[PDB]
RNA sequence: GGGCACCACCAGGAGUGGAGCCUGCGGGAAACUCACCAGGUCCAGACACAAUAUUUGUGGGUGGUGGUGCAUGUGAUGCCCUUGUUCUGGCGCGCGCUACACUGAC
């Protein structure tokens, strides 16, 4: 759900595969369903995260910069959320502050 | 036959090795400023020292006159200075594959400020005022090899040219520099491979690939 | 040229402020149900805009007229199509972005039928959406890594002093050894 | 690392 | 349909850096100056499985033997726990005597 | 309909020398190359074809063959090329007096001719070079011969000027599967294409017109990166 | 014409030569000739507004005690380049043995 080989695009291939590709492009639905209450049966197989290509376009440093490291290689597995949780505006301003 | 700047019409492959690091010395006469022949003497003169190479601009020339397309006949080669000297580069010459040899060429081509033939019915080396539209003809595309673009097959994009639009393709010969120094003159920026290349090696599959698309 | 969910959030509660005077929209947490706008409203030009004009309409909002609150609706209204044209329609979720607010301005329509200026922005709305291609992702594609390289190699002295030291000691030593055995044979 | 650009130097 | 879990890499003791997938007697070779009996014998000291991972053997268990290895000592422990001018001068005399014996020859 | 892959690292292909003998990959030689020592007296030397030539003529060879600059030139495009990146060929040299060089393909070669000399003739009295860090041999000289180092599923060929042309393209695309190439090429100045015809199979040519051995090994590379999609 | 041979053919096998120990057998980074190289010391020291008896509080000028062809020294010349004072030092040959092979080690 990240992304797609059969719509990223080859160089090394035909005017066949370009057509093929031109058409299931225009072709393509998103198959998810949001008010289904069924989890195995929203389709969310199916779909792409444009909320995160947002995210990607947050305006914030730290949110960016947290974000293009979901873009970035896959390297590590640990993050420990227990470090991540204590956070809000005030601790935020805190840490920024130190017609 | 022979091309040169005086014919502006049919399809052609024009190159540029864009400043190209080539300075001379005077000690007493005249030495190239070859890096590895005297770094001291570049330490006292300022200019650093990994930036004058002119071992790959050697190294780019031989591509270029040894490609089969030289044989057809249908590039030539333009040299865009560091400090504003403009050299064409004939198609129908041996430079020597000697570095002692092409580096006296080098500096006796910067002191007479033009070779030509003992043959003496056309010339070899010529020395002309940038910039480059001067000679570069109508139909012209500019494009940059660089790596930051995204890359495209040559196949394709030769063919995809028509036919009288003539090709100019723009190389930065040096070893490091920031490869915004060509848009006031090209046209637009094109990737070739996933890695990074040399020039020599870009530029022999630039027209390996026009070979195969013209069918040498 | 930046995104804020905090104002499509805001846009999401005070339109339904505007509305509620709920079921179709429970996802939403709003504040005061009551202050809404009933089917009295006149919508000429004529009527007050945002005007700019600070204090006079802060510190005195309180005793509400219809008009003041139409004032700050077209306000929004403004402020919305205003930055859809800047940002939103550029952004790649654009889709599920803008899904809830056609929603919300939809209802207006249902509700009343008669403004325009919502009117053109639900147009300008499906001209957007049926423009855009809304392809799925792309982000993980690397270029290939190349092979590490490396670079070639070519070209403690009391210890070698010791070592030459001691060559010539043991090469001294035998060629003495072989004159003495020589005179005296 | 090292992509067309030479060598090291003593 | 759920079930839940009760692992950390290469860890830093005592200067240098260790392993974290193979077992503890590997791990406290790996650990700089100590054997393998010792590894055995202070292990089945501070009662932690043999067969676990470095992985395995979580914080608690980690500062005991951290403890132990840093006072032995005090747990029952043995000592076996813990870890030109000549040249010169004989050169110079041999040459120039047997020189000296050349030329008197 | 088809998951991806795990793990999407991008990682390092696998690199190569010789004591793999299974994966399908691509090999150059370097026939006849010059690279001769010498002892000028006090110091070593590699043989030069412009600045010493009353010296080889006192020594009575042909300064018209003894000349490195090609195979400088030669190696310099090929470890720098593309498959190299992509880890896909490895050299050998097989000079004109007999030795055989395997050059692995993680080295860089030295830009300079000078320096290239000064490691050429190192290497030509040493037999080993370590690398800056001194753990792996980059350079190994080795033993005769070189299809008693080649992998054992290999298509042998020269190329010669005379032999009838073919597009690479259509020959890697006419090539089996496991079907390694080994191309020899004739690095010489001046001489007969004579060097293998024992050793390989059958001589090609790339154009009517005559190349260098450079852009002979230029045109086999990209008629091989557009045979591999690379 | 015939016969022969691990000083030949053919098939292979094993050695010498890399590294260490050794009985034994022979025997010219930099500088056309009071330079460079390398070291360190002198300085890289206009003015405008306010005020003390030249310096301070506040604004700011910067390329030529320049090279330079060429034509009659005439050229607000075209390019290039600037970014000097001071003492010091420059063995070869060679047989044996031991290392290095999950072709394992305990």
Redesign the pocket.
């Known amino acids: 759900m990240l992304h797609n080989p059969a719509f990223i695009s080859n160089p090394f291939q035909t005017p066949d595969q370009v057509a093929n590709l031109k058409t299931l492009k225009e072709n393509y639905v998103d198959p998810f369903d949001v008010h289904e209450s069924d989890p195995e049966l929203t389709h969310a197989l199916d779909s792409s995260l444009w909320e995160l290509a947002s995210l990607m376009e947050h305006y914030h440093p730290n949110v960016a910069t947290l974000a293009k490291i979901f873009a970035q290689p896959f390297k590590k597995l640990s993050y420990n959320m227990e470090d991540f949780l204590d956070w809000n505006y005030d601790s935020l301003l805190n840490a920024e502050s130190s017609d | 036959p022979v091309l040169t700047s005086k014919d502006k019409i049919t399809k052609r492959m024009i190159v540029v090795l864009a400043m190209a690091s080539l300075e001379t010395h005077k000690?007493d006469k005249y030495v190239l400023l070859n890096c590895d022949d005297?770094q001291?003497?570049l330490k006292?003169?300022?200019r650093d020292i990994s930036e004058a190479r002119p071992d790959i601009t050697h190294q780019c020339l031989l591509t270029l006159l040894d490609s089969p397309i030289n044989k057809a006949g249908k590039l030539q080669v333009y040299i865009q200075t560091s400090?504003?000297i403009l050299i064409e580069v004939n198609p129908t010459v041996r430079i020597p594959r000697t570095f002692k040899r092409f580096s006296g060429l080098m500096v006796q081509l910067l002191h007479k400020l033009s070779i030509r033939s003992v043959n003496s019915e056309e010339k070899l080396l010529k020395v002309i005022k940038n910039p480059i539209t001067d000679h570069l003809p109508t139909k012209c595309r500019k494009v940059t090899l660089s790596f930051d673009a995204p890359v495209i097959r040559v196949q394709d994009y030769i063919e995809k040219l028509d036919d009288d639009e003539s090709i100019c393709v723009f190389v930065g010969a040096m070893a490091r520099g920031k490869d915004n120094f060509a848009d006031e003159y090209v046209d637009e920026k094109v990737g070739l491979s996933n890695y990074p290349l040399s020039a020599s090696v870009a530029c022999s599959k630039f027209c390996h690939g026009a070979e195969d698309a013209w069918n040498i | 040229k930046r995104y804020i969910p905090e104002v499509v959030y805001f846009f999401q509660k005070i339109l339904l402020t505007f509305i509620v005077e709920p079921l179709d929209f429970e996802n939403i947490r709003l504040d005061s149900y009551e202050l809404g706008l009933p089917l009295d409203v006149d919508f000429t030009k004529k009527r007050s805009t945002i005007i700019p004009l600070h204090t006079l309409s802060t510190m005195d909002t309180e005793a509400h007229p219809v008009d003041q609150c139409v004032s700050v609706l077209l306000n929004v209204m403004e402020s919305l199509d205003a930055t859809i044209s800047t940002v939103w329609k550029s952004l790649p979720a654009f889709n599920e972005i803008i899904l809830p607010i056609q929603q919300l301005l939809s209802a207006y329509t249902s509700k009343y039928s008669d403004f325009e200026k919502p009117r053109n922005i639900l147009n300008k709305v499906e001209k957007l959406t049926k423009f855009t291609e809304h392809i799925p992702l792309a982000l993980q594609n690397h270029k290939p890594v190349s092979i590490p390289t490396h670079a070639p190699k070519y070209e403690d002295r009391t210890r070698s002093e010791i070592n030459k030291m001691k060559?010539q000691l043991?090469?001294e030593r035998?060629?003495t050894?072989?004159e003495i055995?020589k005179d005296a044979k | 690392t090292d992509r067309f650009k030479g060598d090291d130097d003593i | 349909s759920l079930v839940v879990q009760e692992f950390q890499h290469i860890l830093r003791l005592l200067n240098t850096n260790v392993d974290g997938n193979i077992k503890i007697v590997y791990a406290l070779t790996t650990i700089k100056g100590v054997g393998r009996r010792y590894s055995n014998l202070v292990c089945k000291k501070a009662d932690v499985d043999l067969h676990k991972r470095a992985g395995e053997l979580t914080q608690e268990e980690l500062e005991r033997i951290v403890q132990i290895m840093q006072n032995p000592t005090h747990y029952k422990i043995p000592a076996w726990f813990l870890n030109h001018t000549l040249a010169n001068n004989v050169e110079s005399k041999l040459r120039d005597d047997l020189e000296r014996l050349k030329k008197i020859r």
Request: hydrophobic share 35%.
């Open positions: 000690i005297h001291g003497l006292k003169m300022g400090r504003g | 060559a043991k090469k035998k060629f050894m072989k055995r």
